[PDB]
Amino acid sequence: AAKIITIVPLVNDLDPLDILYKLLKCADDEGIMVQKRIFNVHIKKFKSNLKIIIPDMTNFLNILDCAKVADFVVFGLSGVQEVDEEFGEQIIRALELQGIASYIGVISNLSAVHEKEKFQLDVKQSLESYFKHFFPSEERVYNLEKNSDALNVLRTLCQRLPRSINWRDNRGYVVADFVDFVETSPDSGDLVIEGTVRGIGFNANRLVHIPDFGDFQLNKIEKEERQLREFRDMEKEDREFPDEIELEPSESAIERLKRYRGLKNLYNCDWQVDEKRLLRIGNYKNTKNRIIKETKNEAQAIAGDRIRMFIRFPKFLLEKIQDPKQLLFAVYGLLLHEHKNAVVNFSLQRWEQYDKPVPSQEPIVVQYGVRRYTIQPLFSQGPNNVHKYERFLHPDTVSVATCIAPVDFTQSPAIFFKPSPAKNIELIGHGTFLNADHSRILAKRAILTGHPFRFHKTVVTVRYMFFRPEDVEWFKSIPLFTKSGRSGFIKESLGTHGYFKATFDGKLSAQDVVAMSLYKRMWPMPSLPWN
């Protein structure tokens, strides 16, 4: 069974094939050297097989995807060019946040630094400290031009036990060496795949996932600036006045507040899980552990088995499949029921240095594990089982983004992004799949404020909350409060423009602000896959 190595140059001045040559050369075997993008090589020197993947370096997602399947990631650093904040640095961060196995840093490049040798070494040392910043396990950064440093790296790749990646190792996966098709019906056929099994294995009675194609059945197994400023302005509004609603004299409160219900305090909410065909799960923690135990047991092809895998595959997709020795063709097992949609909950924290606002309900993409979906999330905070909906992702804390997507039964890392011609993509967030839990109720608050201005001992009279008597009358029965902590109730309508009379606990002043609080139940939205 081969160790999967992928080479990731963190600077565009580095040629990935140069790193490969230097690594291969320090095995005295000119029968390796003469030998488009994914290579199987024997190392008769450490008696080891390596499968070396060079991603398409001009596609961020392809990079991420080669790194997923990797046992070792070899990072190329540059002696003369700085790592780019917007590209290579982001590769480092995306690589860790999605889950990375083992990793080693190299320079293929030192001689390009045309300065005294104390200087060159101190550039290496500075690369070692930039690297240690992200990968503390990694003291040294290996000079691939010094033979004995090249040999070190090679020996490690061949012999050292790889680190593990939870989400991908608790499902099965395979990197395809050969891919061929076979007709069986007019509309479809068998996509035949050859590779070594990794992970927990495969069972023919299960589904299989190919990015970016979808889920498939197994037959058998053989051995721009405009939108920004508007969202920015709404973010500022919601920020200064949450969750205020300002009625105008012209409009109807009955019609504006149409889906809202009376509710002061959020711990007193007694909404059921009623109606606005999804999977619902008793306890997520337990069934997760049942499913993984189950699939491990029922597996028929086990890590290290050479496999011929027949996948029920439609013909119109054949056009999109490209050479498995040039781009990566990988196949991930799905666990029981990961095909089925459910009310799902991720966690989410802004990316480093991400300024732009990220509002609820807006098209965003998640990668979680290997899957990628366009979701429309509802944000809220970390109680009594109901949570305050927040219209915008808060500034500097972790939130819960809930929606309807297919369940994940590892607890895959999550990375959130939009497309944006940067590196054709815009990285906005990161977190992990927490949950299927349709008991999480999302409630959106609305605050109406009014000004008390006449005081007859017991009775205050208030204006500019409502602007029509018939609005005052519709909402008569919702409790009032003041930000100073008093509690109240509307007595009667007063006049014709929404003045009302209200009685309260204590005495109020004309500095006091009286308010009314309403909540609207917020329903998780559906999502669809992304390619």
Numbering used by the authors: 82 to 116, 121 to 308, 465 to 517, 527 to 632, 636 to 674, 677 to 786
Paste lines from the article.
The 5' region of pre-rRNA that consists of the 5' external transcribed spacer (5' ETS), 18S rRNA and the internal transcribed spacer 1 (ITS1) is co-transcriptionally packed into a terminal ball of ~40 nm in size. These particles represent the earliest assembly intermediates of 40S and are known as the 90S pre-ribosome or the SSU processome. Within 90S, the pre-rRNA is cleaved at sites A0 and A1 in the 5' ETS and site A2 in the ITS1, yielding a 20S pre-rRNA intermediate. The fully assembled 90S contains an unprocessed pre-18S rRNA, U3 snoRNA, approximately 51 assembly factors and 18 r-proteins with a molecular mass of 5.0 megadaltons.
Bms1 is a GTPase and associates with Rcl1. The binding site of Bms1 overlaps significantly with that of Tsr1, suggesting that Bms1 is replaced by Tsr1 during the transition of 90S to pre-40S.
